[PDB]
Structure formats: C-alpha cells, structure tokens
Amino acid sequence: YEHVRRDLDPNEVWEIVGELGDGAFGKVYKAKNKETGALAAAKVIETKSEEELEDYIVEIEILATCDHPYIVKLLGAYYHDGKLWIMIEFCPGGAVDAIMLELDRGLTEPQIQVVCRQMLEALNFLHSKRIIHRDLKAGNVLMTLEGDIRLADFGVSAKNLKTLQKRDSFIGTPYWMAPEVVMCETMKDTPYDYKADIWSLGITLIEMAQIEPPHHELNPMRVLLAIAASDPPTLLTPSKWSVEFRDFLAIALDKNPETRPSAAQLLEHPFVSSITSNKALRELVAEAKAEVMEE
Amino acid sequence: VRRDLDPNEVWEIVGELKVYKAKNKETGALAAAKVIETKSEEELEDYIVEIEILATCDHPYIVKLLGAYYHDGKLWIMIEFCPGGAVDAIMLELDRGLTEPQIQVVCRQMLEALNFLHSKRIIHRDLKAGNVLMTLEGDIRLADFGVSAKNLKTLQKRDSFIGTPYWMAPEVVMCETMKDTPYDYKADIWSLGITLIEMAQIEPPHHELNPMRVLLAIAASDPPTLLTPSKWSVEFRDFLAIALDKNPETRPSAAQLLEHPFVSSITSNKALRELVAEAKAEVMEE
Ligand SMILES: O=C(Nc1ccc(Oc2ccc3[nH]c(NC(=O)c4ccco4)nc3c2)cc1)Nc1cc(C(F)(F)F)ccc1F
Ligand SMILES: O=C(Nc1ccc(Oc2ccc3[nH]c(NC(=O)c4ccco4)nc3c2)cc1)Nc1cc(C(F)(F)F)ccc1F
C-alpha cells in the first residue's frame, strides 16, 4: 500500500458525475475535480479485506511504473470507507472503437499510422520493463484532444494482473516433460512473452481499417479454431491501402512468434518510421468531438 | 495448520530423509516431517497450499497427510512414513529395472491416483520414479517432492487465459485457451509413459543428454520406445505408444487408459510386495 493513501477522503477532491463506457468489466466513473473542474476516471472497487486489496493494488503498481507518454496516466489512489479508488486522467477524445461507431467509419491510413507508431512506442516501453499487455484492441486505445493515444488495459482480471508483470517458468523435470509443456512453457519468462502483443497490434490495425477484427462473424469460441487453422489475415481491399501498410501487416501477423519482429524493430518499418506528427489523428478526434457537440 | 501446539511435544526427530524422519512420542508411529522455515505470515500462506492439496488427496495411492503445525516460524507438514522408499532407489539398489508384472502394478496404481487427482482438478506435473513411494504391502504412495511455493497454486488450479479471442496470437490460442480445462491433465499422461520406460530401463529416454539439451530433443524427436522391444509384451508397447502421443488432444486420459489390457486385469499387488522385500534385503548387504 505504498501508492495508496488511507488518510485522504477522495470525496473531498472528486465528484462523481457519471459512468464511463458500458461497464462490461466493472464500474468506471466519470469524476469532476470539485475545485478545478478537471476530469478523471475513477475505478472504484469494494474489497473490505487487506488480502483482496493486495491483488487489486497490483494494477496501481503497474500504472505507477508505466509513466510513458502513450500509457494512461495514474493520478493517484485512495483506500477509504472500504473502497479502493484508482484515479486516471480523463482522455477527452474517447476510445478508438467508440470513435468509429460515432463516425460510422474506420480510420484512414494516416490516422492508423499515428496509432500504430504510438502503440509501438508504448509496447517498446512496456516490453523493456518486462510488462506485457495481452489484450490490445481498439477499445483499449484512448485518445486526447491533441491526437495522442493513451493505452489502457480495461479488461484483464485482477487475478491475472501479476502475470502481466512476470511469467512463471516451466514446471517439471526435463526428461519427463510432455511436448506441449516444453512448447508452451520453456520460453516463458523470456522476451518470447512479448511477441503476442505484436500480433494483436496487427489485428488492431485491421480492426481500425475495417471497424471489426478478422473472423468477427464467428462466436468467441469458434474464432479460436479459425485463428489456429487460417493463414494470417490480410486487408480486405488491398488496393485501398499502401504497400507499406500491407507489408507491415504481413510481417507483424507472423504465426511463428520466433520470427515475428519486436516493437523496436517495427519502429524502423517504413509504415511508421517517418511518422513524426499526430495531426491526422488529431483531426479524427476533432471530427468526433464536433459530432458530439450536436448531441 | 495448527498454531497452538509445539510439534516437538508430539514428534521426536530420529533422522533425516529438509525432511526429517519423526517418531510419534505417544504411539511410536513413523512419519516424515517436512519443516519449512518461513520468514513471515504471508510466507506461511504460500506453503499452506501444499497442505490444502494433501488434505483433499485422501486416496489410497497418494501420500497420507497426518497433520500440520506452524510454530516458532516453521511450518511442519507430517506425512505417513513409506517404509519401501521410492522406486528409483529400488532400481539403484538392485541394479536393474522392474519386471513387466511389477510395472503393471505401478502403472495400474498410478493411473488410479492420477484419475483421482484429475477428478479434483489437481495436476502433478513432475511424475517420475523418484516420486513413487512404496509401502511394505506393495502399494504406491504418489508424492510430489520438488514443488515450489509459487507452483503449488498452479497444481491446484490454472488461471483462465488472458485476452480477447479475435485479437489473440496463434501461440496464445495454442498454449493458453485450453488452460483451466481437462486439457491440463494430459501432460501427466505423457510423464506417466516416460516413468514406465524409466522403470523398465532404470533411466528415462535421452538420459545421456544434459537437462536443458533434452528439452530440444523432446521437441525434435518422435515419441520414445522401449530399447529391446521383444522383452516386453505387445500390450505394454501398445500402452506406451498410446500414452506417448505428442498431441495432448489425441492422448488418452487416465480413466481411458485404465481400460487398456496392460492394466485392466491387474487384481493383486503381489509383484510389488515381492520387489519391496527384495530391495530391502539388498540394502542389508550394502
Ligand atoms: O489501463 C488500466 N486501467 C484503467 C482503468 C480505468 C480506465 O478508465 C478510463 C480512463 C480514462 C478514460 N477516458 C475516457 N473517455 C471517455 O470515455 C470519453 C467519451 C467521450 C470523450 O471521452 N474514458 C476513460 C476510462 C482506464 C484504464 N490498467 C492497466 C493498464 C496496463 C497498461 F499500461 F499496460 F496499459 C496494464 C495493466 C493494467 F491493469
Ligand atoms: O507429496 C507432497 N509432499 C511430500 C512432502 C514430504 C514427503 O516426504 C516423505 C514422506 C514419506 C516418506 N517415506 C520415505 N521413506 C524413505 O525415505 C525410506 C528409506 C528406506 C525406506 O524408506 N521417505 C519419505 C519422504 C513426501 C511428500 N506434496 C504434493 C503432492 C501432490 C500429489 F498428491 F499430487 F502427489 C501434489 C502437490 C504436492 F505438493
């Protein structure tokens, strides 16, 4: 409980003014600073036991160390009246999936290029700290009005948070170990663990280009079979997209994690290597905000 | 775990097996005392998972928990002493592998134990002859000696997979999406097969390689077979060929293997009772 204040009443600072998202993974509240009017998200968790508090606090540990321009910003944490409050800077551009719904369209390639560049910067940062994300998707890409992303991890269970920090090495004695254990465990606790996010990044790019991820017509159990059996996904209409975009996807959506490149390697790929302005994404956010001003 | 009693008032330490040999001061019964020096209460919580596992595993062919204590910063786990020792020591002492009738009894009993464990969602994950303790009556007591505090939790329950299916990488689909299902139980069936070869030949396959190198050999090689196949029945070789399936999804369960003729007509442990007596008699010569 090093980064959790037990002596400050969060209600002295924050007024709950609504709820954010659709609450599928738990209640996240919109909070307004009673002095300044500044906005925050308040993830509030009822625990009542110091033991369970320890598990939820892992999220605070991760967020506190993940100080990078493109990761959601922890403002503070409180434990008061049997509730853990995790305060995160409000992202006034919303999530990319919500933007595509609001505007009834996918992103343009220049918009995708900004998201991709910044997601790679964030992943290179996380992986450098041995942190993995493991749930990349457009709904975890929040936006600021300046056109920058803030990467979130909304949907991971509290019990799985520790796995994002550190993987367990294999269980067994080698001579007796089953082939699937060798295959699936002996590379854990090495940078092999970071490669999954690179694939998910590729899928997220298709999701942003096409609104929905590949195989979206299937139910969530059936798609697992489709991923195992199918060649890597490609963009539906190649001619709409640059050869650089298609090549980036071909390299990231490598079914073999050993040959799939790292985030640092992909920062040199021509799809993103010259992306030094967020202006295309700033304009996407401006358009979404202008449409909300209608409502 | 009992906290109000000094275990030394109940048990005398009479030797070492850190696992001690202990003698009940009231009854003279012999036990193993696994004593773990813990630094804090949180540390005492991790180790207690082993007690949770052993307390639910009351099956005839699994080591028998007698009790547990926490006192003076040490957790005591008391397990019924197994006077036949472990199977690996038997083979070392006799300088020979087990006969096929002996392997049949071990295999039958290990399958019963594994079927029981898997029915409680417990996995073993370190099956080997050194984890097969023996009684004088010729019965096994399956142990799991080498587990770490961190890994105890995994033997008890696997975490659900992390991620949303449509976005998941193929290696995550392959290695994670079947966790927390009976897929988890299949690894033990392969290890059982290797243990049977170990008992037939003293050493497991690839024993000449170092432990990190063998991981590569397991991935690269066809399933192992018995070195001198004519010495072993069609049924034994077939049982192994079925159990040592590199694909866990086509590998059978313990319940399914209990129907195999290599073990399905085993009704007496006499072969193992004789083996234990022979091993003890050889130890007397050493
Ligand atoms: O990421 C989190 N937690 C977390 C918890 C709550 C949360 O709620 C938020 C925060 C800001 C928001 N801004 C908005 N805006 C709008 O709705 C909106 C509509 C119209 C305009 O604007 N909605 C928000 C919801 C966001 C994140 N955890 C986490 C992260 C990582 C990391 F580092 F690898 F990414 C690893 C492990 C982790 F556990
Ligand atoms: O299995 C344990 N723990 C454990 C801890 C200590 C232990 O010490 C023992 C116990 C009895 C002995 N008898 C002998 N006899 C001789 O040396 C001997 C020499 C000459 C003659 O005789 N040595 C023993 C050592 C045995 C087991 N854990 C565990 C089990 C499972 C399970 F269920 F799936 F298998 C899952 C998770 C687990 F954590």
XYZ file of C-alpha atoms and ligand atoms in Angstrom:
659
model
C 0.000 0.000 0.000
C 2.880 2.342 -0.824
C 0.986 4.241 -3.551
C -2.405 4.150 -1.781
C -3.484 6.966 0.536
C -5.502 5.778 3.534
C -5.690 9.235 5.154
C -7.306 11.303 2.367
C -11.028 11.239 1.597
C -11.348 11.108 -2.224
C -14.814 12.662 -1.995
C -13.148 15.866 -0.769
C -11.492 16.171 -4.190
C -13.745 14.317 -6.634
C -17.442 14.473 -7.517
C -18.914 11.523 -9.408
C -20.742 12.961 -12.429
C -21.467 9.836 -14.469
C -20.262 6.451 -15.655
C -17.737 5.807 -18.428
C -18.012 3.105 -21.064
C -20.685 0.425 -20.833
C -19.333 -1.150 -17.635
C -18.788 -4.624 -19.089
C -15.647 -5.169 -16.971
C -16.760 -3.211 -13.903
C -17.904 0.278 -12.947
C -15.635 3.139 -14.002
C -16.987 6.536 -13.008
C -16.519 9.955 -14.536
C -15.215 12.247 -11.799
C -15.023 16.040 -11.738
C -12.491 17.873 -9.595
C -14.515 19.937 -7.121
C -12.021 22.817 -7.281
C -10.790 22.948 -10.877
C -13.369 21.078 -12.942
C -10.658 18.768 -14.288
C -11.918 15.344 -15.327
C -10.734 11.907 -14.261
C -11.851 8.326 -14.476
C -12.433 6.744 -11.074
C -12.158 2.970 -10.943
C -13.747 2.156 -7.593
C -13.506 -1.333 -6.098
C -15.289 -2.587 -2.982
C -12.955 -5.015 -1.191
C -13.261 -4.984 2.656
C -10.181 -7.214 3.158
C -6.494 -6.317 3.173
C -5.807 -9.542 1.256
C -8.018 -8.763 -1.747
C -6.806 -5.158 -1.575
C -3.314 -6.527 -2.246
C -4.438 -8.125 -5.519
C -6.205 -5.030 -6.856
C -3.228 -2.880 -5.860
C -1.166 -4.718 -8.494
C -2.955 -2.532 -11.048
C -1.674 0.531 -9.175
C 1.859 -0.904 -9.130
C 1.767 -1.385 -12.905
C 0.285 2.032 -13.642
C 2.703 3.802 -11.303
C 5.741 2.405 -13.114
C 4.231 2.810 -16.601
C 4.991 6.523 -16.840
C 5.214 6.939 -20.613
C 3.522 9.498 -22.896
C 1.245 6.878 -24.512
C 0.029 4.966 -21.424
C -2.958 6.066 -19.326
C -1.799 8.367 -16.513
C -2.347 7.396 -12.887
C -3.318 10.473 -10.868
C -3.473 8.733 -7.507
C -5.117 6.057 -5.433
C -7.101 6.056 -2.203
C -8.442 3.437 0.169
C -11.338 4.969 2.072
C -14.510 3.589 3.654
C -13.802 0.116 2.299
C -13.309 1.197 -1.324
C -10.172 1.346 -3.452
C -10.226 4.375 -5.764
C -7.873 4.309 -8.756
C -7.843 7.750 -10.386
C -6.762 8.009 -14.032
C -6.512 11.113 -16.201
C -9.601 11.507 -18.360
C -8.985 11.054 -22.095
C -11.377 13.521 -23.756
C -11.091 12.038 -27.259
C -12.625 8.741 -26.158
C -11.707 5.258 -27.288
C -10.961 4.455 -30.918
C -13.748 1.873 -31.128
C -16.232 4.478 -29.864
C -14.947 6.978 -32.437
C -15.514 4.514 -35.284
C -19.060 3.939 -34.025
C -19.738 7.664 -33.615
C -18.457 8.495 -37.113
C -19.771 5.263 -38.695
C -16.472 4.550 -40.434
C -12.983 3.165 -39.997
C -9.778 5.151 -39.764
C -7.867 6.487 -42.745
C -4.370 5.166 -43.322
C -2.650 8.335 -41.986
C -4.776 8.037 -38.844
C -3.809 4.366 -38.491
C -0.152 5.292 -38.987
C -0.224 7.594 -35.951
C -1.961 4.989 -33.791
C 0.487 2.326 -34.945
C 3.569 4.463 -34.321
C 2.422 5.432 -30.834
C 1.278 1.905 -29.947
C 4.732 0.635 -30.933
C 6.371 3.273 -28.725
C 4.156 2.177 -25.828
C 4.838 -1.522 -26.415
C 8.584 -0.991 -26.703
C 8.341 0.808 -23.352
C 6.259 -1.905 -21.672
C 8.332 -4.794 -23.008
C 11.547 -3.049 -21.936
C 10.139 -3.306 -18.403
C 9.120 -6.964 -18.946
C 5.448 -5.924 -18.871
C 3.088 -7.438 -21.430
C -0.360 -6.137 -22.334
C -2.076 -9.202 -23.845
C -5.396 -7.530 -24.722
C -4.595 -4.983 -27.422
C -7.662 -3.813 -29.352
C -9.163 -0.501 -30.408
C -11.308 -0.329 -27.258
C -8.103 -0.089 -25.201
C -6.785 2.868 -27.247
C -7.998 6.079 -25.606
C -7.429 9.480 -27.208
C -6.550 13.003 -26.136
C -7.680 16.122 -27.985
C -4.103 16.696 -29.166
C -4.325 13.485 -31.198
C -2.241 11.221 -28.940
C -3.171 7.777 -27.672
C -3.314 6.602 -24.080
C -3.086 2.819 -23.957
C -5.345 1.152 -21.383
C -5.865 -2.471 -20.274
C -9.506 -2.340 -19.137
C -10.482 -5.979 -19.234
C -7.788 -8.023 -17.508
C -8.948 -9.781 -14.356
C -7.403 -8.747 -11.051
C -6.114 -12.299 -10.569
C -4.213 -12.116 -13.882
C -2.533 -8.742 -13.243
C 0.577 -10.362 -11.761
C 1.093 -12.316 -14.990
C 1.436 -9.038 -16.898
C 4.407 -8.217 -14.631
C 6.156 -11.596 -14.642
C 5.659 -15.051 -16.150
C 6.302 -18.316 -14.312
C 8.997 -20.626 -15.652
C 8.215 -24.224 -16.563
C 7.012 -26.857 -14.097
C 8.564 -30.306 -14.384
C 11.826 -32.188 -14.698
C 13.008 -32.042 -18.333
C 13.387 -35.742 -19.182
C 9.780 -36.442 -18.147
C 8.094 -33.312 -19.522
C 5.302 -33.526 -22.081
C 5.888 -31.971 -25.529
C 3.116 -29.394 -25.084
C 4.672 -28.297 -21.789
C 8.065 -27.949 -23.471
C 6.487 -25.995 -26.326
C 4.314 -23.724 -24.184
C 6.363 -23.171 -21.006
C 10.101 -23.361 -21.671
C 10.145 -19.947 -23.412
C 8.062 -18.257 -20.714
C 9.912 -15.686 -18.616
C 11.873 -14.631 -21.730
C 11.215 -11.990 -24.428
C 9.216 -14.684 -26.243
C 6.377 -13.490 -23.990
C 6.408 -10.085 -25.702
C 5.648 -11.364 -29.213
C 1.929 -11.989 -28.642
C 1.312 -8.232 -28.391
C 2.897 -7.690 -31.820
C 0.321 -9.980 -33.425
C -2.517 -8.311 -31.512
C -1.236 -4.932 -32.717
C -1.552 -6.163 -36.293
C -5.122 -7.311 -35.662
C -5.893 -3.935 -34.095
C -4.703 -2.204 -37.274
C -7.106 -4.314 -39.346
C -9.847 -3.547 -36.818
C -9.221 0.180 -37.248
C -9.154 -0.089 -41.050
C -12.292 -2.238 -41.236
C -14.130 -1.431 -37.958
C -14.217 -5.119 -36.990
C -11.389 -7.634 -36.485
C -10.943 -10.639 -38.777
C -13.382 -13.529 -38.327
C -15.743 -11.177 -36.488
C -18.783 -13.135 -37.718
C -17.870 -16.129 -35.530
C -18.645 -16.514 -31.842
C -15.727 -16.046 -29.416
C -15.088 -19.781 -29.013
C -15.347 -20.596 -32.720
C -12.863 -17.872 -33.690
C -10.122 -19.666 -31.749
C -10.349 -22.539 -34.231
C -10.291 -20.088 -37.143
C -7.114 -18.412 -35.875
C -5.355 -21.759 -35.482
C -6.397 -23.038 -38.918
C -6.250 -19.947 -41.141
C -3.402 -18.177 -42.853
C -2.710 -14.783 -41.276
C -5.417 -12.199 -42.001
C -4.932 -9.570 -44.686
C -6.756 -6.364 -45.531
C -9.987 -6.983 -47.417
C -9.338 -4.482 -50.244
C -5.556 -4.268 -50.795
C -5.805 -1.508 -53.411
C -7.262 0.879 -50.807
C -4.062 0.699 -48.740
C -0.369 1.321 -49.265
C 2.131 -1.448 -49.929
C 3.828 -0.315 -46.710
C 0.668 -0.986 -44.684
C 0.196 -4.412 -46.262
C 3.862 -5.291 -45.708
C 3.731 -4.143 -42.082
C 0.777 -6.469 -41.512
C 2.472 -9.374 -43.306
C 5.484 -9.043 -41.002
C 3.570 -8.466 -37.752
C 0.962 -11.169 -38.436
C 3.578 -13.907 -38.492
C 2.148 -17.074 -36.966
C 5.647 -18.029 -35.763
C 6.474 -15.871 -32.706
C 10.191 -16.643 -33.043
C 10.359 -14.811 -36.391
C 7.800 -12.116 -35.544
C 9.702 -8.834 -35.007
C 9.878 -6.793 -31.830
C 8.266 -3.393 -31.376
C 11.685 -1.739 -31.596
C 12.335 -3.448 -34.929
C 8.922 -2.401 -36.260
C 9.624 1.247 -35.384
C 12.045 1.160 -38.342
C 9.455 -0.138 -40.806
C 8.512 2.439 -43.487
C 4.832 2.273 -42.466
C 5.733 4.197 -39.282
C 9.407 5.171 -39.427
C 8.715 8.696 -40.754
C 5.605 9.344 -38.614
C 6.614 12.393 -36.543
C 3.284 14.294 -36.407
C -0.001 13.226 -34.826
C -2.026 15.695 -36.920
C -4.050 13.099 -38.857
C -5.239 11.576 -35.593
C -5.780 14.995 -34.017
C -8.191 15.674 -36.883
C -10.045 12.397 -36.343
C -10.633 13.400 -32.719
C -11.698 16.899 -33.774
C -14.306 15.387 -36.095
C -15.642 13.048 -33.410
C -15.809 15.906 -30.895
C -17.645 18.104 -33.404
C -20.232 15.357 -33.907
C -20.765 15.060 -30.143
C -21.388 18.808 -29.923
C -24.521 18.006 -31.976
C -25.926 15.698 -29.303
C -2.405 -25.564 10.194
C -2.275 -25.829 13.982
C -0.700 -22.831 15.727
C -1.272 -23.517 19.436
C 0.939 -26.613 19.785
C 4.693 -27.155 19.730
C 5.191 -30.088 17.313
C 8.262 -31.217 19.279
C 5.851 -32.201 22.072
C 4.200 -34.636 19.644
C 7.052 -35.854 17.412
C 10.651 -36.865 18.079
C 13.137 -36.266 15.269
C 15.046 -39.525 14.764
C 16.787 -38.946 11.431
C 16.747 -37.270 8.041
C 15.115 -38.396 4.806
C 14.844 -30.613 4.753
C 12.685 -33.662 5.512
C 13.150 -35.421 8.844
C 12.184 -38.875 9.999
C 9.968 -38.476 13.046
C 8.582 -40.824 15.679
C 5.297 -40.136 17.435
C 6.088 -39.853 21.137
C 2.734 -41.417 22.083
C 2.388 -44.251 19.547
C 5.844 -44.772 18.041
C 4.380 -44.330 14.556
C 6.909 -43.194 11.965
C 6.399 -40.163 9.746
C 8.261 -37.751 7.535
C 8.369 -34.176 8.836
C 8.797 -31.588 6.086
C 9.863 -28.482 8.020
C 9.967 -25.134 6.218
C 11.463 -22.092 7.930
C 9.168 -19.230 6.909
C 10.089 -15.569 7.326
C 6.585 -14.092 7.670
C 2.875 -14.890 7.820
C 2.427 -14.190 4.106
C 5.170 -16.763 3.525
C 3.245 -19.188 5.744
C 0.264 -18.726 3.406
C 2.037 -19.815 0.214
C 3.384 -23.024 1.749
C -0.028 -23.900 3.211
C -1.236 -24.607 -0.340
C 0.659 -27.901 -0.152
C -1.361 -28.764 2.952
C -4.595 -27.848 1.154
C -3.663 -30.204 -1.685
C -2.608 -33.046 0.602
C -5.697 -32.657 2.792
C -8.044 -33.134 -0.175
C -5.965 -36.019 -1.583
C -7.125 -38.800 0.765
C -6.823 -41.530 -1.910
C -5.132 -44.866 -1.048
C -2.289 -44.354 -3.545
C -1.274 -40.790 -2.575
C 0.992 -39.845 0.347
C -1.034 -39.508 3.563
C -1.122 -36.208 5.436
C -1.122 -36.785 9.199
C -1.220 -33.154 10.318
C 0.355 -29.740 10.066
C 1.788 -27.264 12.565
C 3.127 -23.721 12.493
C 5.364 -22.864 15.432
C 8.499 -20.791 16.044
C 8.348 -19.598 12.446
C 8.481 -23.125 10.994
C 5.701 -24.928 9.142
C 5.651 -28.673 9.847
C 3.983 -30.979 7.319
C 3.640 -34.516 8.682
C 3.307 -37.377 6.191
C 2.986 -41.083 6.894
C 6.350 -42.790 6.510
C 6.620 -45.113 3.500
C 8.908 -47.996 4.521
C 9.531 -49.220 0.963
C 11.171 -45.965 -0.102
C 10.986 -44.699 -3.665
C 11.120 -46.762 -6.840
C 14.243 -45.040 -8.176
C 16.213 -46.207 -5.124
C 14.918 -49.756 -5.624
C 16.358 -49.820 -9.147
C 19.663 -48.332 -7.970
C 19.957 -50.930 -5.208
C 19.092 -53.944 -7.374
C 20.932 -52.523 -10.411
C 18.015 -53.490 -12.634
C 14.720 -52.213 -13.910
C 11.349 -53.544 -12.866
C 9.870 -56.671 -14.392
C 6.759 -56.280 -16.515
C 4.437 -57.630 -13.763
C 5.974 -55.094 -11.379
C 5.474 -52.253 -13.877
C 1.869 -53.367 -14.358
C 1.061 -52.879 -10.666
C 2.789 -49.493 -10.522
C 1.048 -48.406 -13.721
C -2.393 -49.528 -12.547
C -1.999 -47.755 -9.204
C -0.500 -44.598 -10.732
C -3.452 -44.464 -13.134
C -5.907 -44.750 -10.237
C -4.062 -41.979 -8.399
C -3.970 -39.737 -11.470
C -7.648 -40.315 -12.256
C -8.369 -39.276 -8.665
C -6.144 -36.189 -8.819
C -7.557 -35.073 -12.153
C -11.105 -35.556 -10.835
C -10.241 -32.903 -8.224
C -8.641 -30.672 -10.896
C -5.192 -31.266 -9.365
C -2.293 -31.907 -11.717
C 1.014 -33.440 -10.680
C 3.449 -32.265 -13.391
C 6.580 -33.987 -12.004
C 5.817 -37.696 -12.357
C 8.946 -39.858 -12.156
C 10.089 -42.964 -10.312
C 11.593 -40.839 -7.525
C 8.099 -39.579 -6.666
C 6.638 -43.101 -6.304
C 6.998 -44.124 -2.665
C 6.171 -47.670 -1.537
C 4.643 -49.463 1.439
C 5.520 -52.940 2.648
C 2.185 -54.227 1.360
C 3.269 -53.434 -2.197
C 1.216 -50.273 -2.727
C 2.457 -46.977 -4.094
C 2.131 -43.615 -2.396
C 2.467 -40.904 -5.026
C 4.465 -37.887 -3.845
C 5.326 -34.528 -5.444
C 8.626 -33.685 -3.732
C 10.042 -30.952 -5.916
C 7.268 -28.337 -5.992
C 7.966 -24.670 -5.251
C 5.652 -22.409 -3.272
C 4.825 -20.405 -6.404
C 3.992 -23.546 -8.382
C 1.773 -25.154 -5.720
C -1.055 -22.793 -6.694
C -0.831 -23.887 -10.335
C -1.111 -27.579 -9.451
C -4.318 -26.708 -7.602
C -5.907 -24.505 -10.285
C -4.882 -22.966 -13.600
C -5.611 -19.343 -14.428
C -8.060 -18.545 -17.188
C -6.459 -17.220 -20.359
C -5.697 -13.521 -20.822
C -7.001 -11.780 -23.924
C -9.967 -11.359 -26.210
C -10.229 -14.215 -28.746
C -10.429 -12.296 -32.044
C -7.157 -10.451 -31.330
C -5.169 -13.334 -29.844
C -1.886 -14.538 -31.311
C -1.740 -18.169 -32.515
C 0.727 -19.224 -29.817
C -1.605 -17.835 -27.146
C -4.554 -19.685 -28.697
C -2.476 -22.859 -28.790
C -0.916 -22.663 -25.330
C -3.427 -20.753 -23.177
C -7.034 -21.104 -24.381
C -7.300 -24.721 -23.171
C -5.974 -23.938 -19.690
C -8.417 -24.395 -16.816
C -9.953 -27.344 -18.706
C -9.176 -31.097 -18.660
C -6.581 -30.404 -21.367
C -4.363 -29.571 -18.384
C -4.490 -33.193 -17.225
C -2.916 -34.644 -20.372
C 0.692 -33.673 -19.560
C 0.706 -36.131 -16.648
C -0.243 -38.967 -19.018
C 2.881 -38.410 -21.107
C 5.021 -38.201 -17.965
C 3.466 -41.475 -16.820
C 4.624 -43.105 -20.046
C 8.158 -41.797 -19.542
C 8.051 -43.072 -15.964
C 7.174 -46.544 -17.261
C 10.197 -46.509 -19.583
C 12.289 -45.248 -16.662
C 11.101 -48.214 -14.602
C 11.774 -50.646 -17.453
C 15.259 -49.274 -18.199
C 16.333 -47.512 -14.945
C 16.823 -44.204 -16.779
C 14.369 -42.156 -18.864
C 14.841 -41.610 -22.605
C 17.562 -39.153 -23.624
C 19.274 -39.653 -20.244
C 22.733 -39.205 -21.784
C 21.959 -35.539 -22.577
C 22.021 -32.682 -20.115
C 18.688 -31.369 -18.780
C 18.468 -28.245 -20.940
C 19.524 -30.177 -24.047
C 16.783 -32.767 -23.531
C 14.099 -30.092 -23.913
C 15.279 -29.718 -27.514
C 15.306 -33.495 -28.024
C 11.739 -33.887 -26.749
C 10.521 -31.281 -29.242
C 12.551 -32.699 -32.144
C 12.108 -36.449 -31.614
C 9.388 -38.983 -32.259
C 7.955 -40.463 -29.060
C 10.365 -42.815 -27.290
C 10.000 -46.582 -27.443
C 11.463 -49.394 -25.379
C 15.081 -50.208 -26.182
C 14.660 -54.004 -26.507
C 11.047 -54.346 -27.668
C 10.942 -58.159 -27.769
C 11.387 -58.294 -23.978
C 8.050 -56.560 -23.442
C 4.509 -57.626 -24.227
C 2.525 -56.296 -27.164
C 0.207 -54.790 -24.547
C 2.975 -52.838 -22.792
C 4.387 -51.493 -26.057
C 0.889 -50.549 -27.227
C 0.048 -48.854 -23.912
C 3.199 -46.754 -24.274
C 2.507 -45.916 -27.920
C -0.959 -44.676 -26.925
C 0.183 -42.697 -23.869
C 3.271 -41.195 -25.537
C 1.266 -39.267 -28.096
C 2.899 -35.894 -28.726
C -0.554 -34.376 -29.365
C -2.296 -33.894 -25.985
C -5.706 -33.778 -27.669
C -5.411 -37.336 -29.031
C -3.583 -38.608 -25.941
C -5.950 -40.595 -23.682
C -6.983 -39.760 -20.139
C -6.140 -41.870 -17.102
C -9.709 -43.205 -16.979
C -9.413 -44.258 -20.623
C -6.054 -45.969 -20.031
C -7.492 -47.927 -17.094
C -9.478 -49.834 -19.754
C -6.304 -50.923 -21.560
C -5.422 -54.649 -21.231
C -1.945 -53.786 -19.890
C -3.625 -52.885 -16.579
C -7.328 -53.798 -16.795
C -6.932 -57.330 -15.369
C -4.447 -56.473 -12.593
C -6.015 -57.563 -9.300
C -3.065 -58.157 -6.937
C -0.066 -56.101 -5.840
C 1.980 -59.241 -5.067
C 4.668 -58.459 -7.654
C 5.423 -55.139 -5.948
C 5.264 -56.587 -2.449
C 7.985 -59.008 -3.574
C 10.033 -56.199 -5.152
C 9.993 -54.157 -1.933
C 11.145 -57.165 0.095
C 13.927 -57.890 -2.405
C 15.118 -54.275 -2.330
C 15.180 -54.154 1.472
C 17.146 -57.412 1.543
C 19.725 -55.928 -0.840
C 20.070 -52.781 1.277
C 21.078 -55.075 4.144
C 24.089 -56.165 2.066
C 25.316 -52.618 1.385
O -5.339 0.755 -18.014
C -5.588 0.313 -16.898
N -6.631 0.732 -16.124
C -7.614 1.689 -16.452
C -8.687 1.808 -15.581
C -9.734 2.659 -15.873
C -9.717 3.398 -17.042
O -10.849 4.174 -17.275
C -10.805 5.271 -18.125
C -9.748 6.174 -18.091
C -9.761 7.289 -18.908
C -10.850 7.469 -19.749
N -11.159 8.443 -20.669
C -12.380 8.153 -21.180
N -13.066 8.944 -22.062
C -14.339 8.686 -22.496
O -14.991 7.712 -22.123
C -14.908 9.666 -23.438
C -16.104 9.710 -24.061
C -16.117 10.908 -24.825
C -14.949 11.506 -24.622
O -14.167 10.767 -23.766
N -12.875 7.031 -20.686
C -11.917 6.576 -19.778
C -11.898 5.450 -18.963
C -8.646 3.293 -17.918
C -7.599 2.439 -17.624
N -4.956 -0.768 -16.359
C -3.794 -1.386 -16.858
C -3.014 -0.869 -17.888
C -1.884 -1.552 -18.325
C -1.055 -0.978 -19.423
F -0.274 0.011 -19.006
F -0.261 -1.870 -19.983
F -1.788 -0.474 -20.400
C -1.535 -2.761 -17.733
C -2.287 -3.275 -16.693
C -3.387 -2.572 -16.272
F -4.152 -3.068 -15.277
O 3.832 -35.097 -1.869
C 3.945 -33.972 -1.392
N 4.729 -33.669 -0.313
C 5.590 -34.534 0.399
C 6.422 -33.954 1.347
C 7.348 -34.721 2.028
C 7.447 -36.076 1.768
O 8.443 -36.752 2.474
C 8.410 -38.135 2.623
C 7.257 -38.784 3.052
C 7.277 -40.145 3.292
C 8.468 -40.826 3.095
N 8.817 -42.150 3.246
C 10.137 -42.263 2.951
N 10.870 -43.418 3.046
C 12.238 -43.465 2.949
O 12.935 -42.467 2.780
C 12.849 -44.797 3.079
C 14.140 -45.188 3.020
C 14.147 -46.591 3.225
C 12.883 -46.961 3.394
O 12.045 -45.877 3.311
N 10.664 -41.109 2.586
C 9.624 -40.183 2.668
C 9.601 -38.815 2.409
C 6.617 -36.667 0.827
C 5.692 -35.896 0.145
N 3.414 -32.855 -1.970
C 2.481 -32.823 -3.025
C 1.846 -33.951 -3.537
C 0.952 -33.833 -4.597
C 0.276 -35.053 -5.131
F -0.663 -35.518 -4.311
F -0.314 -34.847 -6.294
F 1.122 -36.056 -5.333
C 0.690 -32.582 -5.142
C 1.290 -31.452 -4.622
C 2.162 -31.596 -3.574
F 2.778 -30.506 -3.066
